[PDB]
Design a protein around this ligand. Structure first.
Ligand SMILES: Nc1ncnc2c1ncn2[C@@H]1O[C@H](COP(=O)(O)OP(=O)(O)OP(=O)(O)O)[C@@H](O)[C@H]1O
Ligand SMILES: Nc1ncnc2c1ncn2[C@@H]1O[C@H](COP(=O)(O)OP(=O)(O)OP(=O)(O)O)[C@@H](O)[C@H]1O
Lengths: 738, 242, 49
């Protein structure tokens, strides 16, 4: 509210914080000694957090050059020599955490128990010379003597770690909030120099967005990016998925839906990070369940190391299959046998049985690992789409499925059980659609249609092995497995498993695994993406060949039936043109493999009054069927190579001349030196927006602020009006104010 | 050098020097730069060929082993399909050089209840291995010729619409007659900047001036902030003062 | 990276590069946080003694 924002500006609140800062600076620096008053110190740090949080809330809808912003710097400059002690105290303890647990400090330990008596801290501090002379001696007072021999650094490090981080980050956000707003203030600039250590430490975690709303103007918003979230964003799997999304949106997608697709990709990426977090290993039925859970996550983590094993075995098995031989007389006219002929040590027959058993096990572990690594994402991507259709479209309330798509009909089975949002985060999707469509239509009809608990029994909260099979929902499991069994990736892995099982019946079935896998390694897919890009057109050309040759069969069958004598003498009844079916087979099988058309096998047309009537027949076969119709086949592969390249060239030339969030080109931002490069890495960024969604969902709905709650309200309404799309906070607040 | 020394042991080693040198004269490199541009992909296609023919060798070895009789009579034990290794060698050496696939050497498939089971075998060899897989090989050389040309076309269309030092396009400088041509030859120039580095290093560190010493300090710090990158002395000191 | 470790020990490292004072410049840039004599022996630079 603007009224209360200005009211506290024309007040004595600034005179109250300065007194609070003065006591706080000298209090913790004095309370830290003797370690006997940590509870008071911990409570003291708690009061510090609430002051800056209130200060941040005073800078929510601030203009670039506002009175409130200009007053806060006035408070800070007069509060000098006190906040610096606060920052210096934070810096001293933060550096210790990095120093402890490192190789340099681990070399100064003297006993297995772990301790440094009284002054080895100075020796440890001298190495990695960061702490000043006065600083290190202050820390010893801040620690305990412990009979001058038992200073435990493990507990000492974890004393003021969490309290320092929360206060330190909020100070950094507050300091950078003013700096980015008031550009011309020499007092503020020199004030930031002594606070550079705090800013330089919290740079990786300080986010920055440019949401627009609540004032019809662009507003910057700051937040915290966790270490784990940033680590998961740099995984090769995530980065590759990001590149695929950008490629799809630029070419396959288009405007008026780019923001809708981006948020959907943002939600999918968050769920992927959720799955990868719960499968990480680091950090009597009970024992069995623990082993099974760890074993299952072992397969999920090592899924791509198993696909490289199912291929290595298929290459090894097929290598020893090159020694097969057929003999009428078996070494160990019917009864033809197959046996190894290695002509060397017989260490290959046992190898085939050993490797065949191993391949089936590996090919079976992949389908289990896939069922617990990528299947949940498929279920999440399908539950989410159904949920957004019930509420914002009423697909099962007002409209009906088109009756020709199996997805609409099969999805009707799941909206009856009390487990519909099993993987989707939105647990209240049943009540939300009830409150959105339960008035126009039957309020109880929606309750029974969705299988939701009846309002009659909804009293608004008035108040072993056998036990397993009443906790399993029959309908939901049937629906879930129907989605899995129609998945393309699962079916391919299912086909891989059954063929390996079939390979024991006959050992030559293992050659099929050589084909479908070697194509998908790193680059054969791209080569295979030219043949199958024009796949619909490479088949119709063949269908055109089967028609042209038919029309040539009709003419050759009625007029040139004496020329097809495929015999020399006394064997005249060969004549592979006497009936339509054989002539078509002759003109199709050996009718196009020949280089000369059909004249390479038909007997020579000497002077028969039909020599000129057949030369035209022969020479048109060569042109229309061979020279031309086999040039279209080679003319479609070549164009495919030049179409996929141009598809990727456009993406590179479209992401380097636009902002992907605004519509402003790179020329406008380039007036400032390296402006566009800075604009796309700090102000507008895919990671920053993605990390915000992971931040809104993680944060409780009761802990939101003026800007976060406004965005969260729009996010649940699926109204992406908070993306700028027309401004960049430099065209509005700094076009003239700079 | 070692091959020339080896040429005295046998005089026919001097033919190897004919190959590696004649390619690098003035233009055979550019032609050779289309074959080797997609060098990583021209090998994988062959690796795909060595797999497709293996799968055809498996089928022909188990079901069509009577058709590979490469002899007329009284010489029946020729049968170049009886073992896997020889059938693979037969299907790989003379299995793709033929214009018709593998039906140009295998004996004629008359009515044997397998005539239709083999015609599909023969006619798929012609399409999948010869018509298509040898069109990718010719489809990679052709795309390489069109990729190196577009690579050089972009360079010409990027150095004639920008300053390579500032970011200002050629349209802004062209308000003055021949402005961009004059701007890239007098104010911003690769030679002038290059000749400055040859001037700072040659000049003694004690003979520098107010501007040269400032640049020299930045040059030793590897902070290239003295390049304009946003202005041209005509957008700042002469935008209104002309 | 591994093969280049053999050259930063002899008093001829900038034989062709113009910057002859590259041994002292790195010493004055990293000789405070790390061992001042450690850089002298690592680079083969003449000892401060
Ligand atoms: N938020 C953004 N807005 C606009 N363009 C962006 C944004 N993020 C990235 N880009 C574009 O991508 C370029 C670099 O980011 P990106 O990571 O997508 O590319 P990359 O360096 O090729 O990939 P990577 O870092 O995965 O190796 C930028 O120069 C810009 O062209
Ligand atoms: N400093 C520069 N800034 C911008 N463009 C430049 C600069 N120097 C050269 N160019 C570009 O190159 C063109 C001419 O210079 P350049 O020598 O590179 O080309 P060229 O005439 O084809 O070559 P050459 O003189 O070697 O025969 C200019 O018209 C301009 O497009």
């Amino acid at each position: 509210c603007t009224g209360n924002q200005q009211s506290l500006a024309h007040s004595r609140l600034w005179d109250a914080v300065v007194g609070f800062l003065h006591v706080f600076a000298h209090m913790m620096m004095k309370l830290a000694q003797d370690s006997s008053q940590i509870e008071l110190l911990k409570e003291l740090l708690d009061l510090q957090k609430d002051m800056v949080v209130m200060l941040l809330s005073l800078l929510e809808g601030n203009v670039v050059n506002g009175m409130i912003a200009r007053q806060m710097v006035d408070m800070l400059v007069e509060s000098s020599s006190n906040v610096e002690m606060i920052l210096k105290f934070f810096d001293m303890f933060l550096k210790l955490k990095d120093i402890v647990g490192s190789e340099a400090f681990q070399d100064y330990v003297t006993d297995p128990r772990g301790l440094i008596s009284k002054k080895d801290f100075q020796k440890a501090m001298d190495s990695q010379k960061q702490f000043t002379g006065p600083e290190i001696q202050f820390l010893l007072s801040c620690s305990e003597a412990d009979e001058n021999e038992m200073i435990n650094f493990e507990e000492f490090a974890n004393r003021f770690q969490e309290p320092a981080r929360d206060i330190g980050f909020n100070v950094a956000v507050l300091l950078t909030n003013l700096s980015e707003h008031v550009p011309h203030d020499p007092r503020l600039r020199n004030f930031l120099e002594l606070a550079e250590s705090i800013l330089e430490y919290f740079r990786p975690y300080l986010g920055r967005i440019e949401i627009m709303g609540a004032s019809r103007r662009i507003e910057r918003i700051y937040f915290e990016i966790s270490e784990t979230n940033r680590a998961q964003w740099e995984m090769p799997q995530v980065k590759e998925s990001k590149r695929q999304f950008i490629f799809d949106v630029v070419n396959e997608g288009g405007e008026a839906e780019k923001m809708e697709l981006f948020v959907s990709f943002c939600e999918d990426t968050i769920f992927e990070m959720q799955i990868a977090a719960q499968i990480s290993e680091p950090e009597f039925w009970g024992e069995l369940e623990v082993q099974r859970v760890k074993f299952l996550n072992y397969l999920s983590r090592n899924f791509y190391t198993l696909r490289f094993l199912a291929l290595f075995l298929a290459f090894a098995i097929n290598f020893i299959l090159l020694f097969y031989k057929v003999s009428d007389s078996p070494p160990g006219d019917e009864n033809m046998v197959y046996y190894f002929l290695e002509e060397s040590t017989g260490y290959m027959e046992p190898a085939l049985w050993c490797l065949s058993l191993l391949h089936t096990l590996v090919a079976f572990l992949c389908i289990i690992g896939y069922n617990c690594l990528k299947v949940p994402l498929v279920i999440f991507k399908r539950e989410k789409e159904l949920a957004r259709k019930l509420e914002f479209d009423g697909l099962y309330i007002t409209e009906q499925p088109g009756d020709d798509d199996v997805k609409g009909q099969w999805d009707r089975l799941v909206l009856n059980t009390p487990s519909f949002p099993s993987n989707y985060w939105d647990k209240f999707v049943k009540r939300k659609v009830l409150d959105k469509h339960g008035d126009i239509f039957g309020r109880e009809r929606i309750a029974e249609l969705l299988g939701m608990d009846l309002a009659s029994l909804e009293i608004t909260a008035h108040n072993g092995l056998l036990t397993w099979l009443m906790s399993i929902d029959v309908k939901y499991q049937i629906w879930k497995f129907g989605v899995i069994f129609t998945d393309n990736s699962f079916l391919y892995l299912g086909w891989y498993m059954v063929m390996s099982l079939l390979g024991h019946y006959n050992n030559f079935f293992f050659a099929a695994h050589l084909l479908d896998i070697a194509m998908g390694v790193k680059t054969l897919r791209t080569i295979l993406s030219s043949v199958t890009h024009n796949g619909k057109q490479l088949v119709m050309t063949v269908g055109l060949l089967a028609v042209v040759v038919y029309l040539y069969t009709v003419v050759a069958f009625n007029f040139f039936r004496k020329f097809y004598n495929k015999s020399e003498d006394e064997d005249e009844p060969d004549m592979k043109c006497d009936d339509m079916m054989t002539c078509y087979l002759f003109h199709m099988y050996v009718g196009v493999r020949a280089g000369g058309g059909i004249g390479d096998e038909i007997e020579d047309p000497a002077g028969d009054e039909y020599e000129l009537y057949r030369v035209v027949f022969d020479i048109t076969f060569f042109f229309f069927v061979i020279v031309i119709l086999l040039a279209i086949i080679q003319g479609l592969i070549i164009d495919a190579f030049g179409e996929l390249r141009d598809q990727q060239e456009q993406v590179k030339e479209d992401m380097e001349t636009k902002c992907f969030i605004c519509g402003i080109g790179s020329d406008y931002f380039d007036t400032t030196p390296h402006g566009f490069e800075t604009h796309t890495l700090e102000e507008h960024n895919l990671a920053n927006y993605m990390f915000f969604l992971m931040y809104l969902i993680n944060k409780d709905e009761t802990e939101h602020t003026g800007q976060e709650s406004y965005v969260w309200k729009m996010y649940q309404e699926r109204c992406w009006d908070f993306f700028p799309a027309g401004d960049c906070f430099r065209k509005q607040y700094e076009d003239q104010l700079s």
